[PDB]
Amino acid sequence: AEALLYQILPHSVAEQLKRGETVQAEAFDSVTIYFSDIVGFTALSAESTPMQVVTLLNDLYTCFDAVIDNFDVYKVETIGDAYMVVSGLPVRNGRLHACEVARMALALLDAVRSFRIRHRPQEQLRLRIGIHTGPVCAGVVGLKMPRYCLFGDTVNTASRMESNGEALKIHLSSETKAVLEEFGGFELELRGDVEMKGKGKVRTYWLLGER
C-alpha cells in the first residue's frame, strides 16, 4: 500500500515518510546535475511504425537503469529520451558527487556503444551529456502522488551545457572541472572556445576518461 505510494521518492525520504516523520524543504550548497539527450531522435522516430519506437524506448530504459543503479546517483525524471540525474542531493556526501557523476557518464558512454536497435542493427545511437555543479534547494511536492523536486539556476545551467554539447561527448562546465582536477585521476581537455548561451566569457571542457 504505502510501498507503492513512495515509489518515486528516494529511499531515504521514503523511509522518513513511512515511519511518520516529516520531511522539510532543504538547501544544499553543492550538488551535481547530469543532463543527457539523444541527438537525432525525432528523425529516427519519424520513420518507424508505432511499435518499433515503443520497443526502442523500452530497451533504452532497461539498458540505462541497469547502469544508473550501479552508483550513488538518484534519477529525478525520465520524459521521452532525456535523462536528469542528480548526486549529492538527498543525503550529503562531501565532494564525491562530482566523482560519482563523472564515472557514471563514462559508464553510460560505454554502455551505449553496445546498445542494439532491433529494427536497424548496423547502426549506433548517439548521445549528448552535460554535467554541472552548484547549490540547489530541494523538497517534496505533491500530495496525491509525491515527487522530489529541485529549484535553482544550476539546473538550467546544466541543461544549457547539455544543449550546447556535442554528440558522444561529455560536456563539463568550469565549476565541476575544478572539483574533478582537485580530486585527480581524470582526463579533461579545454574545449578551446567559449559558449554563447547566456554569456560569452564562460569556458567549458570535454571529459575524455579516467586513469
Ligand X SMILES: Nc1nc2c(ncn2[C@@H]2O[C@H](COP(=O)(O)CP(=O)(O)OP(=O)(O)O)[C@@H](O)[C@H]2O)c(=O)[nH]1
Task: Kindly list the residues in this chain that would bind a copy of itself in the complex (CB under 8 A).
Answer: 1, 4-5, 7-8, 24-27, 42, 45-46, 49-51, 53-54, 57-58, 61-62, 65, 77, 79-80, 137-145, 149, 151, 153, 156
Which CB sits closer to ligand X, 39 or 63? Answer: 39
For the chain, give the number of residues.
Answer: 211
Q: Tell me the three cell numbers of residue 75.
A: 534519477
Angle between helices 96-112 and 50-68 (to 10 degrees): 140
- Contact assessment for residue 62 and residue 23, using Cβ atoms and an 8 Å cutoff: no
Binding site for ligand X (CB under 6 A): 37-42, 45, 77, 79-80, 84, 150-153, 155-156, 159
Among residues 41, 83, 148, 205, the one that binds Mg ion under rule CB under 5 A: 41
Q: Rounded to an integer, what distance in angstroms lies between the CA atom of residue 73 and that of residue 102? A: 11
Q: Is the dihedral of CA 180, 173, 200, 38 positive or negative?
A: positive
Which CB sits closer to Mg ion, 25 or 167? Answer: 167
Enumerate residues 6+ apart whose C-beta is below 8 A from 19: none
Which CB sits closer to Mg ion, 28 or 41? Answer: 41
Half-sphere exposure of 159 (CA within 13 A, CB side): 8
State the minimum distance, in angstroms, from the CB of residue 185 to ligand X: 30
State the minimum distance, in angstroms, from the CB of residue 84 to Mg ion: 13
Among residues 14, 32, 35, 81, the one that binds Mg ion under rule CB under 5 A: 81
Interacting residues with Mg ion (CB under 5 A): 37-38, 41, 81
